[PDB]
Amino acid sequence: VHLTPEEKSAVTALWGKVNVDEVGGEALGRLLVVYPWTQRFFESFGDLSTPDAVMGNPKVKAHGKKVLGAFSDGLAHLDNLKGTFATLSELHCDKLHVDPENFRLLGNVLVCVLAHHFGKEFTPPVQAAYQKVVAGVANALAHKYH
Amino acid sequence: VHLTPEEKSAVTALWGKVNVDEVGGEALGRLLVVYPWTQRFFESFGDLSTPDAVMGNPKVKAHGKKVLGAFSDGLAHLDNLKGTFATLSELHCDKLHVDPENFRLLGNVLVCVLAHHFGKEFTPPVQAAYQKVVAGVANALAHKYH
Amino acid sequence: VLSPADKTNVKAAWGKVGAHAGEYGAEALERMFLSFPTTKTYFPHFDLSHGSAQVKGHGKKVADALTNAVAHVDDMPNALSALSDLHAHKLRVDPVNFKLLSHCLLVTLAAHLPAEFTPAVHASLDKFLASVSTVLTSKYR
Amino acid sequence: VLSPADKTNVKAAWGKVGAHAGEYGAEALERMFLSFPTTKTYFPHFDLSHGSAQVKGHGKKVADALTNAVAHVDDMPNALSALSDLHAHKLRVDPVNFKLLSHCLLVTLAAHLPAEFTPAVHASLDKFLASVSTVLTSKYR
Numbered sequence: 239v240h241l242t243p244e245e246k247s248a249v250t251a252l253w254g255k256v257n258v259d260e261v262g263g264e265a266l267g268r269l270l271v272v273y274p275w276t277q278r279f280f281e282s283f284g285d286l287s288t289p290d291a292v293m294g295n296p297k298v299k300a301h302g303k304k305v306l307g308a309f310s311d312g313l314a315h316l317d318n319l320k321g322t323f324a325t326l327s328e329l330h331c332d333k334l335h336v337d338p339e340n341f342r343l344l345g346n347v348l349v350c351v352l353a354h355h356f357g358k359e360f361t362p363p364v365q366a367a368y369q370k371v372v373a374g375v376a377n378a379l380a381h382k383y384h
Numbered sequence: 385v386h387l388t389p390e391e392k393s394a395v396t397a398l399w400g401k402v403n404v405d406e407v408g409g410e411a412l413g414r415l416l417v418v419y420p421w422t423q424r425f426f427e428s429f430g431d432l433s434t435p436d437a438v439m440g441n442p443k444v445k446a447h448g449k450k451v452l453g454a455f456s457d458g459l460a461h462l463d464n465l466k467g468t469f470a471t472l473s474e475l476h477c478d479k480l481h482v483d484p485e486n487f488r489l490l491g492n493v494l495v496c497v498l499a500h501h502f503g504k505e506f507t508p509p510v511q512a513a514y515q516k517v518v519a520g521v522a523n524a525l526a527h528k529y530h
Numbered sequence: 531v532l533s534p535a536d537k538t539n540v541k542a543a544w545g546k547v548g549a550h551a552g553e554y555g556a557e558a559l560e561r562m563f564l565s566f567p568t569t570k571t572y573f574p575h576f577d578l579s580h581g582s583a584q585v586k587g588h589g590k591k592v593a594d595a596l597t598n599a600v601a602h603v604d605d606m607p608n609a610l611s612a613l614s615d616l617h618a619h620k621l622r623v624d625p626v627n628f629k630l631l632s633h634c635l636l637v638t639l640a641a642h643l644p645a646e647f648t649p650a651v652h653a654s655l656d657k658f659l660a661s662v663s664t665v666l667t668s669k670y671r
Numbered sequence: 672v673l674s675p676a677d678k679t680n681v682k683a684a685w686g687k688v689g690a691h692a693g694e695y696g697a698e699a700l701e702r703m704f705l706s707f708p709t710t711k712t713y714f715p716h717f718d719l720s721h722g723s724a725q726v727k728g729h730g731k732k733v734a735d736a737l738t739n740a741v742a743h744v745d746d747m748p749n750a751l752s753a754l755s756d757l758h759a760h761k762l763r764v765d766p767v768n769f770k771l772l773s774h775c776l777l778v779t780l781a782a783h784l785p786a787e788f789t790p791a792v793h794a795s796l797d798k799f800l801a802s803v804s805t806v807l808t809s810k811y812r
């Protein structure tokens with residue numbers, strides 16, 4: 239999306255330090271705990287009654303890594319988020335029936351997790367670039383809904 | 385704004401029947417009555433304390449006509465809303481300091497007014513077209529904010 | 531909070547709806563499904579074609595729930611308790627969707643009640659639907 | 672509604688904030704102005720440059736109102752009635768903006784309090800900021 243070069247490169251450099259497996263697990267887990275209604279898509283994952291059960295759930299963890307893996311591969315296509323996520327947008331709509339507002343919630347949770355991990359390094363300008371990224375991904379994921 | 389040609393003809397068809405002067409005063413007036421916090425921009429307009437004071441205020445009616453006149457003009461440029469509204473976007477941001485959420489609220493109120501005026505003629509499909517149009521105008525008016 | 535004047539306006543406007551409630555509920559849903567297609571994600575099991583029986587049936591249910599709230603306007607959290615539980619624990623509809631249905635209900639009332647949908651009434655109905663939405667979303671977390 | 676566990680969680684987190692409240696308030700504002708530029712429309716009278724003193728001073732006031740809220744967590748409407756009136760009748764900030772500052776405050780807290788910002792505490796803090804927001808916009812209409 240409308241990303242400044244200093245912004246594009248702030249995103250990229252930070253992302254190179256991210257452990258996708260850990261962040262993925264943490265982002266999805268936090269989504270389920272903070273906004274409990276998002277659990278509606280994951281009844282088959284098992285016990286999600288408490289935060290500890292959610293955060294320790296291996297299916298939550300593995301799904302988080304999958305989701306962030308796809309997000310990660312999308313950061314190499316910032317000039318074409320729409321085409322990169324098109325088939326995923328269709329699947330989310332036609333097969334999974336996921337309200338796109340969930341993509342927005344995950345984005346903001348993701349931004350909180352990055353702040354939690356990187357502390358001082360996640361400065362106000364770095365946040366603003368990631369907010370643009372997460373909204374761009376959300377919008378690309380919702381683009382094929384009908 | 386992605387509009388099918390049949391959506392574009394419904395929009396234009398209906399708009400042909402609108403008295404922009406009258407619908408402009410009704411829409412602006414209802415915005416200030418339903419969402420009273422929007423009165424923060426109009427303190428020089430005088431008395432806005434009751435619904436009849438707002439709806440019949442000659443300044444509200446004149447301002448409504450001005451807003452809707454510019455909106456009309458945009459309906460002739462649906463393929464270039466951003467360009468059409470660029471100088472107004474700048475003005476609303478830098479001089480008037482208007483939170484763009486106000487444009488979304490006005491759009492929704494305009495849709496209620498159209499429904500009020502046209503009754504059954506404002507069918508679900510026609511509404512749907514108008515919702516894409518008001519969102520597109522709101523988005524264009526917000527596009528120069530920084 | 532609803533004011534005495536709000537309550538009067540809502541009872542009056544809903545009074546005129548009368549025995550049209552069901553029809554208006556179904557129309558409000560169709561408007562929502564076409565104007566805001568993401569809302570369709572919550573009804574994958576319905577036939578959503580124009581005039582669908584599932585849509586009419588659901589319209590009546592929504593409409594009856596609103597009629598109940600109006601009948602109990604001074605005690606809505608208790609009158610809607612069961613529905614509040616259902617949305618929070620089973621249906622789990624994202625809160626943003628309530629604003630979308632509310633708007634479509636207002637458009638529907640405007641389209642059918644030209645004499646009664648004055649600025650004051652519009653204002654009170656919008657506040658009323660926001661209060662219903664709040665109650666229905668109150669137990670989400 | 673805030674559960675007993677939420678209040679405890681919010682009191683503990685805010686307790687560690689301690690003498691940094693004002694610095695965090697200012698930082699949350701800066702993050703909001705940068706991430707969500709439309710919010711700058713409410714502060715056309717401020718110098719919004721990095722480190723300007725108006726943001727600092729304002730960050731202190733916001734942080735102290737939050738401290739007061741945490742201390743009056745069981746009686747919020749009353750403790751914040753004055754700020755509620757101020758926002759509803761003078762400032763008239765659109766309700767959508769409260770969500771934006773709340774998010775930025777959470778990011779600020781996650782940034783400075785890594786051991787305390789557990790998933791359960793993240794949940795409680797988001798509920799708390801939502802309740803504060805609700806209180807501050809309760810008299811708008």
Ligand code: HEM
Nearest residue numbers: 276279280304305306308309326334336340341344375379
């Ligand atoms: C960053 C945003 C997201 C991206 C990039 C992403 C990506 C993916 C991918 C790559 C898959 C695998 C699909 C396949 O096997 O072909 C998937 C599955 C799925 N996603 Fe997402 N996703 C996102 C957000 C969400 C959110 C927020 C939810 C709901 C809260 C959700 C619900 C699902 C569900 C229910 C599945 C199917 C899992 C299963 O097979 O049991 N997704 N997602």
Ligand code: HEM
Nearest residue numbers: 422425426450451452454455472480482486487490521525
């Ligand atoms: C469809 C969206 C809108 C359009 C097309 C529009 C258009 C216009 C136009 C053509 C002007 C006059 C410009 C000038 O004086 O040079 C104007 C002024 C103004 N607009 Fe907007 N407007 C819209 C929405 C709104 C909204 C929703 C609000 C606030 C609730 C707002 C607040 C104002 C204010 C305060 C002025 C200046 C009034 C004065 O002269 O004192 N506008 N607008």
Ligand code: HEM
Nearest residue numbers: 569572573591592595596613621623627628631662663666
């Ligand atoms: C004005 C606000 C609303 C009210 C009064 C309302 C009321 C109701 C009622 C009375 C039922 C039937 C439950 C029963 O069978 O006893 C229901 C079910 C349902 N509602 Fe809500 N609702 C509201 C908003 C929404 C929203 C915005 C959505 C999502 C877009 C939604 C999605 C559903 C779904 C999916 C069901 C289950 C339908 C089925 O499987 O038969 N509702 N609601």
Ligand code: HEM
Nearest residue numbers: 710713714729732733736737754762764768769772803804
């Ligand atoms: C967490 C929610 C918020 C709280 C607790 C809060 C608290 C406060 C406080 C304590 C004051 C100072 C009143 C005085 O000087 O005595 C104030 C003023 C103000 N607030 Fe709110 N605020 C919140 C959210 C917001 C939002 C989201 C905005 C708009 C983006 C906003 C805009 C303002 C403005 C423009 C002033 C006047 C500042 C000045 O002119 O000095 N506030 N707020």
